[PDB]
């Protein structure tokens, strides 16, 4: 049962290249829950981090990480603590949520993510945001605006070249524009944790931002492919991947941060960015506040 020992499943190119209508998502184990030893979001975030351990993430000193939707109705932030456990000790974590919470982040901002002003560019964006109104399924499942408009503008303006994102989507919480922006990364996928395999949740991953269109993606068709994949792929609830945590921490890659004019970006630079070997952004002092 090899896949049970993996942290989850990543959308394969087999389904990326399909051309299908958007259908209802029908999971055989829908809403089935696996017991924890420990909040469920501990297992969920750890498995996301384990999969990102296999991606070409840029990991610099003073790494800039912003974590949206970090709070829970319990006033705590299990995912932010997992990020603290995963990331380098000198990484800067900023988290945010609509509702009050306390966390192990360096900076915690309350309110709509739209109020979060990122003055500089960041290296990694994690979003677990989900709007409760999405559960009011009436009629056609269309592309959603909501917080995705903010996130898309963030990717276009406040994400370092070489930076990455992991953005939670579901069958009904998704964005045409966000899928299309994945084509501006060196690589992309949707990752579904084994801890939450019974949900249509997935983390849309963009790995190494290039600022230019590498893959032309029809976002509406690609979400239809994501649902087609989920409808076609048995996924058993499992946290076996968390049984051995000896290599859980993010590798301390020491990725360099360089300032370059866009006219200076040549094939060597794009190659380094695409391998997780370089970031291009400011090296100012990071300033992230509420507006």
């Amino acid at each position: 049962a090899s896949a049970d020992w993996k942290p989850g499943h990543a959308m394969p190119s087999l389904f990326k290249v399909q051309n299908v209508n958007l259908e209802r998502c029908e999971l055989a184990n829908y809403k089935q829950s696996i017991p924890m030893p420990v909040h469920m979001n501990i297992a969920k975030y750890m498995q996301l981090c384990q999969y990102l351990n296999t991606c070409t993430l840029a990991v610099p000193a003073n790494m800039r990480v912003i974590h949206f939707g970090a709070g829970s109705d319990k006033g705590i932030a299990p995912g932010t603590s997992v990020l603290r456990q995963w990331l380098p000790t000198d990484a800067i974590i900023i988290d945010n949520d609509l509702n009050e919470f306390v966390s192990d982040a360096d900076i915690t901002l309350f309110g709509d993510c739209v109020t979060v002003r990122v003055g500089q560019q960041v290296d990694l964006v994690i979003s677990d945001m989900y709007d409760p109104t999405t559960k009011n399924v009436t009629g056609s499942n269309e592309s959603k605006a909501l917080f995705f408009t903010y996130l898309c503008n963030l990717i276009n303006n406040n994400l370092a070249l070489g930076g990455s994102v992991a953005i939670k989507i579901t069958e009904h919480s998704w964005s045409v524009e966000l899928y299309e922006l994945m084509g501006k990364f060196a690589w992309w996928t949707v990752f579904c944790t084994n801890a939450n395999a019974s949900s249509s949740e997935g983390f849309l991953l963009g790995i190494n931002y290039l600022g230019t269109i590498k893959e032309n993606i029809d976002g509406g068709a690609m979400h239809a492919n994501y649902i087609f994949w989920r409808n076609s792929t048995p996924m058993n609830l499992s946290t076996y991947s968390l049984f051995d945590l000896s290599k859980f921490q993010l590798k301390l890659k020491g990725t360099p941060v360089l300032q370059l004019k866009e006219s200076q970006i040549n094939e060597l630079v794009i190659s380094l960015l695409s391998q997780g070997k370089l970031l291009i952004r400011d090296n100012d002092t990071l300033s992230v506040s509420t507006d």
């Binding site: 319990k74 932030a77 192990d104 982040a105």
Partner: protein, 120 residues
Amino acid sequence: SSVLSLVNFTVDPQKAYLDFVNAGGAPLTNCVKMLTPKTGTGIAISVKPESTADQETYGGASVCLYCRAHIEHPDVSGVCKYKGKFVQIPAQCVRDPVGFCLSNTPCNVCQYWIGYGCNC
């Protein structure tokens, strides 16, 4: 969230919580318990999880009464000693991580819990 309300009605939140739990009050729940390779050093407070086989590791802010209750921290510098860090709790005390932290002090010389690891 009852005890969380209670420590807003007192001048000594530490004593208020401890008297409450010591008289049968339900300990604060939802402390953020990590999954760790129990191969750590075992010190009290650490930047990364350091649980031994006899310990559990918690996210620091979640076991801090002053963090959880959104009240002023007593540290003269105003910085919380747990927030942004990890706190190791003896495995037999996971019933009340917050009470254990309010009831004990790390060794000022070896930073292990006095009585639970500190051998000085």
